[PDB]
Every structure is written in C-alpha cells, then in structure tokens.
From a paper:
Human MHC class I proteins, or human leukocyte antigens (HLA-I), bind peptides, mostly eight to 14 residues long, for presentation on the cell surface for recognition by cytotoxic immune cells. HLA-I proteins are composed of a polymorphic, integral-membrane heavy- or α-chain (α1, α2 and α3 ectodomains) and an invariant light chain, β2-microglobulin (β2m). In order to coordinate α/β chain co-expression and incorporate specific peptides during secretion from eukaryotic cells, a linked “single-chain trimer” (SCT) construct, coupling all three components into a single polypeptide, has been widely used. Success was ultimately achieved by isolating and recombinantly expressing the VHH domain from a novel, high-affinity, anti-β2m camelid antibody, allowing the crystallization of all SCTs tested.
Since the Y84C/A139C mutation had been reported to yield “empty” HLA-Is by ivRF in the absence of specific introduced peptides, we tested a low affinity peptide incorporated into the SCT design; the A*24-associated YPPVPETF peptide in the A*02:01 SCTY84C/A139C. Density features in the B-pocket were inconstant with either tyrosine (p1 in non-canonical mode) or proline (p2 in canonical mode). A 9-mer “logo” peptide with A*02:01 consensus sequence anchors (YLAAAAAAV) provided a much-improved fit and resulted in improved Rfree during refinement over the linked YPPVPETF peptide but was not included in the deposited coordinates, as the density features are best described as an averaged ensemble of bound peptides. While reasonable statistics for indexing and scaling in tetragonal lattices closely related to the triclinic supergroup could be obtained, molecular replacement solutions that adequately packed the AU could only be obtained when reindexed with a monoclinic lattice. However, these solutions ultimately proved incorrect when select chains overlapped and clashed with symmetry mates in these packings. These conflicts could only be overcome in P1.
Author numbering:
A (entry chain A): 25 to 123, 143 to 334, 340 to 417
B (entry chain B): 3 to 117
The structure:
C-alpha cells in the first residue's frame, strides 16, 4: 500500500563553475503523496525552492520535481533531503557533480483527505504528450484553472470560466467519494486517504482516435476502470461492484465514450495545432557514454518526448543481468534525461553495446567503448 | 565523527513546558544546521525545528508558535523551548546536525511525555 520514493539529484544543464544553472531533485514512485523535500547547500536549507504540480504514473505512484536556480562554485556542495512515511529517517542524496508518433491528452486528479484540517486537498493537472498545460490546486489562491503552457493562454475567458467550473465539480465529486469510500471499507474519520482519477484519449500520427482511458484508484490500489472498449467497466473488489452496477444502471459509460472519442479528440487536435511550435517538435537525445570490474553508463540528454529505450547487449543478446536502468527524469525546461548502467570486466568492455530507440532519431543508434 | 549530546527530556503536565538542549562535539567548523526530529507512532520521524549556524530557522507545522529553537553564538549548542505541550507531543525527540558537506549525524534521542 506504501511505495518508497526514488530520488535523483542532477542539474538541468552540464555544470560549469560560475555559470547559472538549475538544481533538480526528482522524487518518483512513492505513495502516499505526503513528502518533505529539501535542497541543501553546505549543510543548510535553500530558501526559495519551487516544485512541480502533483501528478502520478500508470501504477498510480506520484512524482514531483523540486528545483531552484543556483550558480555552482568550486567549494559549494549540494544535496537533496527527502522524508516520507516509508523512511525511518530523512534520506539524503548528494549531487554527484562529477557525473512520426502518437499523441495524447491526459487529465490527472488527486484528492487527499485531511481529518480535522479542512476540506480535502485537490490537485488536478492536464497533459498533452509530456507537456503539462493546466493545473488546479485547492490550496492555491486563484481558485481557478491556471495555464502552465504558452499555447493555452490564447484561450479566452469563456474557456477558463468553463474549465474552472468543471474542475471544481471534479473536486466536489471526489470530496463525496472520499466519505463514501470511507464507509464502504469501514474506516474511521481519523485516517487520511487518497482518491486518484485519470482519463484521456490517444490519437495516431493521423490525429484519429486510437484509445481512451478512464481509471479510478483508492489509496494507490485499483478501484474501477473503463475497459479498452469504452463500453464496460472493470471492478476490483466487492466495494467497487456497487459503483459498477450504479454506473451501468446510469449508463455512465455511454457518456464517457462520447467525450473520449469526440470532445477529447477534438480539443487535443486544437491544442496540437495551437502549440505546434512546442508540442509537434522532436528533440533528438544528445547521447554519450561514461565509464577487474568496471562500470559502463549510457546517457541521453535534452530529448523530447520522454519515450525512450536504453538497452544493453553482450555479443548481440539482450543482457538484462547486472544492469541498472534509472527512471527518465525531467530537465525542468521541457526536455528529459536518462541513463543505463551495466557491470563489466575491465578489458571486456568492447563486447558490450548500448541501443537508443527514440522517436526523434532517424534510426536506432549504437554505442560502445 | 561527530557526537551529539542531548538532555532536557522527561515527563511534563499538559500545558507545561520543557527545554531541550543539544551540544555537538568535534570541530566547531564541522557542523552547520542543527535541530530536532521526533518519532511518530509509526515508522517515520517528523521535523520539529532546526536552525543554521546563521540563525535561519524552520519549524514543523504542528509546533509553530509553541516551539522556539535558538543557538548559542559560541558553542555548537541548540536549545528547544517547548511551550503549551499536549499529549500529541509525546515522542522521542532526536537531535541532529548537518555537516557543511551535507552529512547528517543523529543523537540517541530523549523521551518526552505529556501525561
């Protein structure tokens, strides 16, 4: 029920002493969403640290990027401290300073109850491909759907008024469900619980409808989900069957199909056109390699979209033993990074190769010592 | 490499107060930030308060206003004045310190109990 965070500390750009840069701490794969992330400078907390809006992956685990602007010098040493319910003590990771395709629109919703601390926390984010473009936070000041990409700011007040009305309704719904789910599972009004909703549509390179999604999760575990055919549901336990029958009797799936197949597609197309300078670009990865037993590390920087495959081979066959693959991470400027590692005998590193499959490369690339 | 000597725990009545103190050994230039985390009923320990050598403080939300952390100019020693204590503040309070290279040191901890 609880997943511990994966921590990465890195800079946006390669570090150059005296050159302005950005220090990143990417925490991913954790549950619940409660996390304390600090950026340290010489055993001291960095004052003005910003972070990205809460979002989560297919497995429902959350991810966050904490970042600040800094100018590294010779003496300064940096790190990231992370506290979480799955940790006996805060974990510190030091900044190792010596180190043609489909499209999609996705909406992610998260609600977390706060017994005896006001209404539940509601965070909503919108994505086109790997670019976030809208957000809503119940704790923010605006109480409005807010832009997070240049190309969405062209929309007029009718758009923003409607999105705010709709997102607030998503919020009210999740508030009711939080109490409902508390009753169905016989839990006390003192514990904190998380409800996660996610839906969206996929289109091919021809912008025609491909797939649609609508999924629901309670405390990180699957609750109910729309099948791939968008005409039936998938319940997870005895509690979710009650909602399934209440939704099949209300023919809810028919309404969702129309949105995913029509409205969702229609506005995804409009977004892709309005932000073509951004969304329809492909940044090829700037690739590189780092190095009786030795370590070989294949890297990939400043690429978009995030979809990428780094695989290892020993004399032709995919070696998946003694290999380390790290989660793709955001650079903070819209691009992404990733690397992979493998143990090798110092002297046999020529019988090893790294394969880079990316949507922005003419053909797969090959790298060896 | 560094030792953290703690003192000032014990039992107190609700509404009462306590002063913790934590003194670091080793080089005076080998510790920057000092403070206290406290044990939760579960697995984790939460931030209570800490302070940098320069006096920059941060408090956990649940102790804001009631708890005050201070530092002695000379000796690497910090002081936690815990006022208006409630039963929910019962916990083992762990002192900690950060090296100027972001290395963490932790003390044994001191039980605090509020009837």
């Amino acid at each position: 029920i609880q997943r511990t965070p994966k921590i990465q500390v890195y800079s946006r750009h390669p570090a150059e002493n005296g050159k302005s840069n950005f220090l990143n701490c990417y925490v991913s794969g954790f549950h619940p969403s409660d996390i304390e992330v600090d950026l340290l400078k010489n055993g001291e907390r960095i004052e003005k640290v910003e972070h990205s809006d809460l979002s989560f992956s297919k497995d429902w685990s959350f991810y966050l990027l904490y970042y600040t602007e800094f100018t590294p010098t010779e003496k300064d040493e940096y790190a990231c401290r992370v506290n979480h319910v799955t940790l006996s003590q805060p974990k510190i990771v030091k900044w190792d300073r010596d180190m043609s395709g489909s499209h999609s629109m996705r909406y992610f919703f998260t609600s977390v109850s706060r017994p005896g601390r006001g209404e539940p926390r509601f965070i909503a984010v919108g994505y086109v491909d790997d670019t976030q473009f809208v957000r809503f936070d119940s704790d923010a000041a605006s109480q409005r759907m807010e832009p997070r990409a240049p190309w969405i700011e062209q929309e007029g007040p009718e758009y923003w008024d409607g999105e705010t009305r709709k997102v607030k309704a998503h919020s009210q719904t999740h508030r009711v469900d939080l109490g409902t789910l508390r009753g169905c599972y016989n839990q006390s009004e003192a514990g904190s619980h998380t409800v996660q909703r996610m839906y969206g549509c996929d289109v091919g390179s021809d912008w025609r409808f491909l797939r649609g999604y609508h999924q629901y999760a309670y405390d990180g575990k699957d609750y109910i989900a729309l099948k791939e055919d968008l005409r039936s549901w998938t319940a997870a336990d005895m509690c979710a069957q009650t909602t399934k029958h209440k939704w099949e009797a209300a023919h809810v799936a028919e309404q969702l199909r129309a949105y995913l197949e029509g409205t969702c597609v229609e506005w995804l197309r409009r977004y892709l056109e309005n932000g073509k300078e951004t969304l329809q670009r492909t940044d090829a990865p700037k690739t590189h390699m780092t190095h009786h037993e030795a370590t070989l590390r294949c890297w990939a920087l400043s690429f978009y979209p995030a979809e990428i495959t780094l695989t290892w081979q020993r004399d032709g066959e995919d070696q998946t033993q003694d290999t380390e693959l790290v989660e793709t991470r955001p650079a903070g400027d819209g691009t992404f990074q990733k690397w992979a590692a493998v143990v090798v005998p110092s002297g046999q590193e020529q019988r090893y190769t790294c394969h880079v499959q990316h949507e922005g490369l003419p053909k797969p690339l090959t790298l060896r010592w | 490499e560094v030792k953290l000597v703690e003192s000032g725990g014990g039992l107190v009545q609700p509404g009462g107060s306590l002063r913790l103190s934590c003194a670091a050994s080793g080089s005076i230039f080998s510790i920057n930030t000092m403070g206290w985390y406290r044990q939760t009923p579960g697995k984790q320990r939460d931030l209570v308060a800490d302070i940098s050598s320069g006096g920059s403080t941060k408090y956990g939300d649940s102790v804001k206003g009631r708890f005050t952390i201070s530092r002695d100019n000379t000796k690497n020693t910090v002081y936690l004045q815990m006022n208006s204590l409630k039963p929910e503040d019962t916990a083992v309070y762990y002192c900690y310190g950060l090296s100027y290279s972001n290395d963490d040191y932790w003390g044994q901890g001191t039980q605090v109990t509020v009837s």
